[PDB]
Design a protein around this nucleic acid. Structure first.
Ligand SMILES: N[C@@H](CC(=O)O)C(=O)O
Ligand SMILES: [Mg+2]
Ligand SMILES: [Mg+2]
Ligand SMILES: [Mg+2]
Ligand SMILES: [Mg+2]
Ligand SMILES: [Mg+2]
Ligand SMILES: [Mg+2]
Ligand SMILES: [Mg+2]
Ligand SMILES: [Mg+2]
Ligand SMILES: [Mg+2]
Ligand SMILES: [Mg+2]
Ligand SMILES: [Mg+2]
Ligand SMILES: [Mg+2]
Ligand SMILES: [Mg+2]
Ligand SMILES: [Mg+2]
Ligand SMILES: [Mg+2]
Ligand SMILES: [Mg+2]
Ligand SMILES: [Mg+2]
Ligand SMILES: [Mg+2]
Lengths: 66, 70, 116, 153
RNA sequence: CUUGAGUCUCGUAGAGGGGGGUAGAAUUCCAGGUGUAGCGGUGAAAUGCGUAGAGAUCUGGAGGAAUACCGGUGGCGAAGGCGGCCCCCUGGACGAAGACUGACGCUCAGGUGCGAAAGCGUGGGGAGCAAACAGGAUUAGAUACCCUGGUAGUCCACGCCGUAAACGAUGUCGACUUGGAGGUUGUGCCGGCGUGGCUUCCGGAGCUAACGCGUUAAGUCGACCGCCUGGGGAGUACGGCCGCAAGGUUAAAACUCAAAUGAAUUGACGGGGGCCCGCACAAGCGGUGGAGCAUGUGGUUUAAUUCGAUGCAACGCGA
């Protein structure tokens, strides 16, 4: 549990911050549900939005079979 | 589910880690869900029915902790 | 005729059949075997035992290339996923990697449900 | 049955050799409760079997059982209208019963004159894998091996 | 006059809408390499594809459609509906501190607009899917279910259609009336205490024919609108209006029946589920059905072939 973005005073998840983003994607590049990491709903939507932006820039992979 | 075999690891342990990695991603679950078309009216219906039974069983489990069988 | 010593096994495990193709690292096939071509038809074709035989016949069919270590691609939902891999290990190959490469659309409309 | 209150029933060993295994052979060969009529067939056939192979009275019958005893059989089972024959290993007690039953049934459908010689002719053939009793054992084994893909539920 | 209604200031969340661009996975096709005998499909098959080299695997290219994971009885919208990512234009909702107008409201026949999918017209596009259609099965038949293919259509632009179990089967607005457990989105004070919006479930009084609803009422009231008067005939005919058409809307009567219907109750039944049992299967032994004869019955015959039993539970039965 323990949504980490509220405890860190986060206001945006900043798709450029790829170190944070890799803690929310599976080993196959799938976004981990907030039910598993205990993320708040508002920040989970920002998280999914940031991950997809990172995928478009080729910072993160869409899948494990690229 | 890309699995790398490690040194001094027996094959069965390596193979067992492959199942756990595949079942974690649910690749066989996605495929079976995708082999036939699901109408949007019936995917909403099965999602609605899955939520109601997870709710119903919880109250059935809660009320069992307030009930004695003998 | 030639030596490769490091090939890739592509298991095609479907609900109706299992196809095993052993290629090289470059994607060039050397030998192949199938559950249907291993003497099993109909109900027998879609069993894990049939897929295991397909692996045995595919390993032996590619025996003249001198493969020693083998990578594995597992594709499809068929029952013969794991049974084929274990038969490949028993054949005498050093399994380097095991990878699931099942195609998942992120796509096209699937066929309508069967009303059986 | 649905209850499982079935226990083993005591069988006396044969008088001339004290063999539990051979007494059951008499019982399987017995017809209409005529046990005396069947002991003479079994004893005179094994007397012939011993004098024809020189091994012994007892283990000459046993070496015939080794070549008739099945190791795996198929049980019918239907799933989608078509029946699946599922091979299953045969427990040691049923292995003897099937072997003795096959020998007796193969012997009865022979061409010899006396049943004692008719049985000894079939028992001797079992030693070198020739009679129709070992040919049914082969058929069961081949049928089980063909249906090996269905060795699951 | 300010409390209903509205405006301004600051910010918040959102698949709200319209236009444009773009990304990755996958399907299909095309060209080529490796390689050899099956592939595909089903309960089982066959049609079909394949030695003219398929399927499998790899490389490159084309094209269209939809946006896995996130994803959630989560969110937004009057409803229909809206789901990759980015930009532009744009609607609404909410919150906090005031200021401002000064009841400026609510409802609304006719009218106007929006309105899933299918369908229609014109011009494009066409991967996958798939009415029609064809073939193969299944079957007593099978104009179906299943399989192999496959055209309209599904996609885009514009225009029409204006109907849905368009449903919460619950018109809109306002007020009042115990609680609990949540979700989502603001906001103030110090994870704790509040206070707003939306939303899910349970439940009290009360109501209800009952099921159930229960501060998001189907409770207690007020304002206005729409609609109903037994079932069938029939949302049909005729007439009017609308539409390119398909049809839509408005909407009878003769005749006929004494019911039709809603909710719940007890049974029974289910090719519903669960748990058990029985020579019920399974595992075995021996039989019957074939032969001759005994015996009973049916039928026939006869003067009479006495009467009765005649699925299991009549037929070596009354006898
Ligand atoms: N597979 C995605 C879209 C593509 O395919 C979906 O089911 O929404
Ligand atoms: Mg199909
Ligand atoms: Mg009107
Ligand atoms: Mg349409
Ligand atoms: Mg058109
Ligand atoms: Mg056209
Ligand atoms: Mg079809
Ligand atoms: Mg609807
Ligand atoms: Mg609805
Ligand atoms: Mg209505
Ligand atoms: Mg309630
Ligand atoms: Mg009409
Ligand atoms: Mg008219
Ligand atoms: Mg039986
Ligand atoms: Mg007879
Ligand atoms: Mg009579
Ligand atoms: Mg009578
Ligand atoms: Mg009776
Ligand atoms: Mg009797």
């Amino acid at each position: 549990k323990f949504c980490r973005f509220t405890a860190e005073g986060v206001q945006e998840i900043d798709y450029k911050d790829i170190a944070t983003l890799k803690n929310y994607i599976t080993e196959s590049g799938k976004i981990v549900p907030s039910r598993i990491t205990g993320t708040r709903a508002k920040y989970q939507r920002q998280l999914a939005r940031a991950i997809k932006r990172a995928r478009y820039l080729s910072l993160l992979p869409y899948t494990d079979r690229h | 589910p890309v699995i790398k075999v490690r040194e001094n690891e027996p094959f069965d342990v390596a193979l067992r880690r492959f199942k756990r990695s595949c079942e974690k991603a649910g690749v066989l679950a996605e495929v079976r869900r995708r082999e036939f078309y699901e109408k949007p009216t019936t995917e909403r219906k099965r999602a609605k029915a899955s939520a109601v039974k997870r709710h119903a069983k919880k109250l059935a489990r809660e009320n069992a902790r307030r009930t004695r069988l003998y | 005729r030639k030596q490769v010593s490091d090939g890739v096994a592509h298991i095609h495990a479907s609900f109706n059949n299992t196809i095993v193709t052993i290629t090289d690292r470059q994607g060039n096939a050397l030998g192949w075997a199938t559950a249907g071509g291993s003497g099993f038809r109909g109900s027998r074709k879609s069993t894990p035992f049939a897929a295991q035989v397909a692996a045995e016949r595919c390993a032996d069919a590619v025996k003249e290339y001198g493969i020693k270590n083998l990578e594995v691609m597992v594709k499809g939902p068929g029952p013969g996923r794991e049974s084929t891999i274990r038969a490949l290990n028993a054949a005498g190959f050093r399994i380097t990697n095991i990878t699931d490469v099942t195609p998942i659309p992120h796509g096209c409309r699937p066929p309508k449900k069967r009303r059986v | 049955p649905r209850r499982r209150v079935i226990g083993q029933r005591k069988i006396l060993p044969d008088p001339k050799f004290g063999s539990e295994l051979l007494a059951k052979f008499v019982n399987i060969l017995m017809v209409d409760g005529k046990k005396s009529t069947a002991e003479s067939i079994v004893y005179s056939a094994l007397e012939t079997l011993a004098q024809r192979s020189g091994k012994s009275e007892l283990e000459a019958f046993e070496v015939a059982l080794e070549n008739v005893r099945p190791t795996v059989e198929v049980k019918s089972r239907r799933v989608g209208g078509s029946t699946y024959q599922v091979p299953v290993e045969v427990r040691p007690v049923r292995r003897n019963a099937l072997a003795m039953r096959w020998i007796v049934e193969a012997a009865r459908k022979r061409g010899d004159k006396s049943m004692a010689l008719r049985l000894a002719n079939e028992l001797s053939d079992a030693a070198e894998n020739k009679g129709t009793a070992v040919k049914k054992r082969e058929d069961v084994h081949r049928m089980a091996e063909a249906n090996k893909a269905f060795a699951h539920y």
